[PDB]
Amino acid sequence: EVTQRELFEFVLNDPLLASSLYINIALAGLSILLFVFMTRGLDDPRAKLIAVSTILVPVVSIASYTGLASGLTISVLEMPAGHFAEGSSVMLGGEEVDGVVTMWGRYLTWALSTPMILLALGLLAGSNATKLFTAITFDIAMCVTGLAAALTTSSHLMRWFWYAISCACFIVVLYILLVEWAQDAKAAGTADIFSTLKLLTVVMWLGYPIVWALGVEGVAVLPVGYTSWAYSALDIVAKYIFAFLLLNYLTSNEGVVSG
Amino acid sequence: EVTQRELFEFVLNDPLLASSLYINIALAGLSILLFVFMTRGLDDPRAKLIAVSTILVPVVSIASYTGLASGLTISVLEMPAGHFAEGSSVMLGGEEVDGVVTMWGRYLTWALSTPMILLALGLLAGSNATKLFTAITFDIAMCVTGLAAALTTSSHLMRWFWYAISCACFIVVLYILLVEWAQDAKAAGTADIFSTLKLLTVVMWLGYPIVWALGVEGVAVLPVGYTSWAYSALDIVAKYIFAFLLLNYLTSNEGVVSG
Amino acid sequence: EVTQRELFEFVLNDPLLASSLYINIALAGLSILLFVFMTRGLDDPRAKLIAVSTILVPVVSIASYTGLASGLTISVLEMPAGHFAEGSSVMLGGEEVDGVVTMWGRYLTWALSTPMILLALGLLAGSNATKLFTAITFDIAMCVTGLAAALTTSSHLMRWFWYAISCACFIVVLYILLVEWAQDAKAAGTADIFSTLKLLTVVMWLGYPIVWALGVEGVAVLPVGYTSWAYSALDIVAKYIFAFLLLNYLTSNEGVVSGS
Numbered sequence: 001e002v003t004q005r006e007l008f009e010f011v012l013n014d015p016l017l018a019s020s021l022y023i024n025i026a027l028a029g030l031s032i033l034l035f036v037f038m039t040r041g042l043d044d045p046r047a048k049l050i051a052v053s054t055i056l057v058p059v060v061s062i063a064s065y066t067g068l069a070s071g072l073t074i075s076v077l078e079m080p081a082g083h084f085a086e087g088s089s090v091m092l093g094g095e096e097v098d099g100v101v102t103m104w105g106r107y108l109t110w111a112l113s114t115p116m117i118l119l120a121l122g123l124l125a126g127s128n129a130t131k132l133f134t135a136i137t138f139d140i141a142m143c144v145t146g147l148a149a150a151l152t153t154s155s156h157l158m159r160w161f162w163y164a165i166s167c168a169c170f171i172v173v174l175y176i177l178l179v180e181w182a183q184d185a186k187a188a189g190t191a192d193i194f195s196t197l198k199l200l201t202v203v204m205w206l207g208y209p210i211v212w213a214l215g216v217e218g219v220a221v222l223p224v225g226y227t228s229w230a231y232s233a234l235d236i237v238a239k240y241i242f243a244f245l246l247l248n249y250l251t252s253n254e255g256v257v258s259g
Numbered sequence: 260e261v262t263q264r265e266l267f268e269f270v271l272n273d274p275l276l277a278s279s280l281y282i283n284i285a286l287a288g289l290s291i292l293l294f295v296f297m298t299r300g301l302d303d304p305r306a307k308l309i310a311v312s313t314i315l316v317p318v319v320s321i322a323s324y325t326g327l328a329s330g331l332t333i334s335v336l337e338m339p340a341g342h343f344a345e346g347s348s349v350m351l352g353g354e355e356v357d358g359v360v361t362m363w364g365r366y367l368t369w370a371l372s373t374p375m376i377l378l379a380l381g382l383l384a385g386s387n388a389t390k391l392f393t394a395i396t397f398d399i400a401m402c403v404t405g406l407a408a409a410l411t412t413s414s415h416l417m418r419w420f421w422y423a424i425s426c427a428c429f430i431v432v433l434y435i436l437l438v439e440w441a442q443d444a445k446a447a448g449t450a451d452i453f454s455t456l457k458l459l460t461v462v463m464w465l466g467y468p469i470v471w472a473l474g475v476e477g478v479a480v481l482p483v484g485y486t487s488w489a490y491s492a493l494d495i496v497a498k499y500i501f502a503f504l505l506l507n508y509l510t511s512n513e514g515v516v517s518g
Numbered sequence: 519e520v521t522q523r524e525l526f527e528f529v530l531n532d533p534l535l536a537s538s539l540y541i542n543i544a545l546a547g548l549s550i551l552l553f554v555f556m557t558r559g560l561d562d563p564r565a566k567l568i569a570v571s572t573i574l575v576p577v578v579s580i581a582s583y584t585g586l587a588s589g590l591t592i593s594v595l596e597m598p599a600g601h602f603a604e605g606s607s608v609m610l611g612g613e614e615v616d617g618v619v620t621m622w623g624r625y626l627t628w629a630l631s632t633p634m635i636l637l638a639l640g641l642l643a644g645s646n647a648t649k650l651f652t653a654i655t656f657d658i659a660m661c662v663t664g665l666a667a668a669l670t671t672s673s674h675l676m677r678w679f680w681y682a683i684s685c686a687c688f689i690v691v692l693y694i695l696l697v698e699w700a701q702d703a704k705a706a707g708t709a710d711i712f713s714t715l716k717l718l719t720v721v722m723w724l725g726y727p728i729v730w731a732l733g734v735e736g737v738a739v740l741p742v743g744y745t746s747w748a749y750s751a752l753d754i755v756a757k758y759i760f761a762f763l764l765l766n767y768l769t770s771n772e773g774v775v776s777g778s
């Protein structure tokens with residue numbers, strides 16, 4: 001009978017875990033303020049659509065980190081036999097319970113933010129509807145199956161099967177990034193900036209599945225505090241710095257992506 | 260371990276509460292039928308897009324009220340330390356239980372119905388995609404964070420922090436409603452009706468965050484039965500008569516909204 | 519009290535229920551490969567929109583069945599007084615638990631795969647955006663209220679009230695398929711194929727509320743293992759062979775639907 005209150009207090013007392021969360025709550029917030037003033041000059045509906053979806057990324061993030069820091073989107077799950085973290089304890093204060101600290105809150109919200117990054121890139125590269133639809137739907141599938149992976153406590157194999165299904169959807173997104181939109185950006189006349197964000201996106205995302213396999217959800221070698229900082233670190237680049245570069249361009253070349 | 264049947268029984272047994280839910284199950288159902296009958300004459304696809312988006316509002320409403328009356332989307336939660344309602348008890352049948360009655364089913368479904376209200380209004384006003392995308396996304400972020408606020412029981416401050424994020428998202432919606440679409444409507448030849456609905460929408464929508472703050476979830480000065488009728492009252496205007504007025508216009512001005 | 523593992527092991531140790539779930543994880547996966555391979559030569563963006571839409575059906579499906587076999591989207595629920603399955607025991611794990619085995623994960627994912635079946639068909643029929651929006655939102659409403667019906671345990675009358683609402687949403691979808699799109703396909707030059715898939719779709723989809731009614735969720739004349747196999751048999755036709763047939767035509771008539 002673990003309460004939200006114990007999880008909140010649990011996030012505290014553990015400076016490694018606590019800092020990684022609250023730090024982003026503020027970084028996301030400040031990021032929004034900056035982006036709003038940076039795009040005040042835009043007047044082109046198509047140029048402003050690109051900015052709105054870019055700005056929504058940090059918006060989903062503060063909510064995501066707040067949900068986590070609060071204990072709303074965190075849970076104690078008893079891993080299945082054969083699992084490395086199986087047999088673990090946590091102790092939410094004075095009473096220690098069986099299981100591990102599951103921060104499914106991240107996986108859930110990714111289904112919201114990532115489609116937004118993609119919407120941004122896709123529009124920058126003058127993508128057509130079919131390609132946007134394809135990237136976004138498989139991207140969402142990737143996130144939701146990952147969340148199902150983390151919540152599966154009945155069998156060790158099922159958990160990894162989920163992981164596999166998520167990787168397969170990932171390749172579809174990677175494929176449109178590297179191959180499809182890369183070509184479309186040329187006709188749109190944004191291959192320059194597109195190449196930049198594209199290179200950024202792929203590298204950064206590629207790291208999320210890795211941290212997962214290492215952290216308690218997977219092999220369980222990395223501590224929850226480090227895995228959290230890893231993601232927290234990845235989000236900082238995969239989202240905020242990514243948002244700045246894109247917006248910085250949009251304001252300088254509103255005529256390019258106009259129409 | 261409160262049961263669903265217990266919350267269902269708790270709704271009945273309480274005249275104020277019972278009537279606020281069951282009356283709207285009937286009004287929304289009657290609204291749907293009336294609205295379908297009123298628009299059976301439309302021919303223009305665009306006019307028809309507006310009519311369906313509008314009819315979906317009471318469709319989501321009847322589902323939402325059934326989810327609450329049946330107890331499926333209600334829960335009894337204990338408020339964090341210092342909350343004005345911490346220490347309250349509810350009493351189900353012959354047993355007394357700690358906590359407050361949280362009708363989170365409303366916050367959740369608003370995420371589906373309010374986007375539809377906005378869809379119909381935006382289109383009626385001749386909005387472009389970028390503004391629709393903006394009103395709608397932040398409208399959803401508003402509803403979702405409001406839900407998070409009602410579901411957060413770990414900290415009193417976290418709750419009001421969720422509420423603040425939600426208010427920020429709300430101003431965005433109000434902005435495009437009061438400024439953006441007010442102008443587009445003139446250009447689309449629908450300023451007369453928009454003005455009536457924009458005024459109705461803004462005044463009514465303002466009432467929800469007030470009701471939330473005054474009820475058990477906030478400073479708890481109003482009983483659960485009172486707060487429920489306040490919302491039901493708002494929905495009757497913000498949803499049903501708002502849809503009647505819009506469809507009555509629509510059915511007499513099919514040509515103007517055609518384009 | 520009822521753990522996921524107990525549910526995951528209840529499925530296993532019950533040949534019927536297990537096979538009804540694992541066989542479709544396999545069929546769904548084999549369908550994706552086959553469909554991907556079949557659609558390699560497509561080039562027209564609109565033709566490829568219909569293809570990706572169709573392929574997502576079996577993608578949603580493999581994940582769905584994994585969630586049911588893993589026990590992640592299964593629950594034991596107690597039926598309301600008056601329910602023909604009230605007072606039932608599932609005999610979960612070692613103890614005998616009250617209630618019935620509810621596979622709500624099916625209803626949850628339908629809200630994601632059925633809209634894709636509809637996008638493909640609407641597109642194939644050359645439907646405008648208004649009819650597509652109408653069919654899809656009411657389809658989702660139908661799925662969601664069906665899920666709520668199964669998840670409601672407070673009142674027997676409330677369960678059938680959800681069921682009725684959901685049915686009302688269903689007629690909207692059926693009307694768009696049988697009346698609207700049937701005419702639109704004649705203009706899009708896909709009259710025969712759409713009429714064929716329209717009939718396959720209408721016949722199989724009607725099977726669902728019938729199964730729901732006859733199974734544990736309904737009047738309970740069909741045990742859980744049998745209700746599960748009936749759903750799985752319906753999925754094989756309404757999803758996999760349905761997609762197979764649609765893509766078979768598509769890959770031979772890309773020009774007809776090439777449009778924009």
Ligand SMILES: *C/C=C(C)/C=C/C=C(C)/C=C/C1=C(C)CCCC1(C)C
Pocket residue numbers: 107110113114142143145146147149162163164166167170205206208209210212235238239
């Ligand atoms: C702001 C967050 C971003 C950009 C997150 C990206 C996340 C991914 C690319 C996650 C991928 C995963 C897999 C491919 C396998 C299973 C587990 C996941 C969810 C970690």
Ligand SMILES: *C/C=C(C)/C=C/C=C(C)/C=C/C1=C(C)CCCC1(C)C
Pocket residue numbers: 366369372373401402404405406408421422423425426429464465467468471494497498
């Ligand atoms: C049919 C329902 C309608 C029109 C609901 C409207 C709801 C709002 C405008 C809610 C706003 C809220 C805030 C601004 C602050 C936090 C709490 C909420 C969710 C009550």
Ligand SMILES: *C/C=C(C)/C=C/C=C(C)/C=C/C1=C(C)CCCC1(C)C
Pocket residue numbers: 625628631632660661663664665667680681682684685686688723724726727730753756757
């Ligand atoms: C891949 C799954 C398919 C094609 C599922 C189709 C499901 C339906 C047509 C369900 C309809 C239902 C009703 C009309 C009433 C209530 C219960 C349902 C959800 C079974």
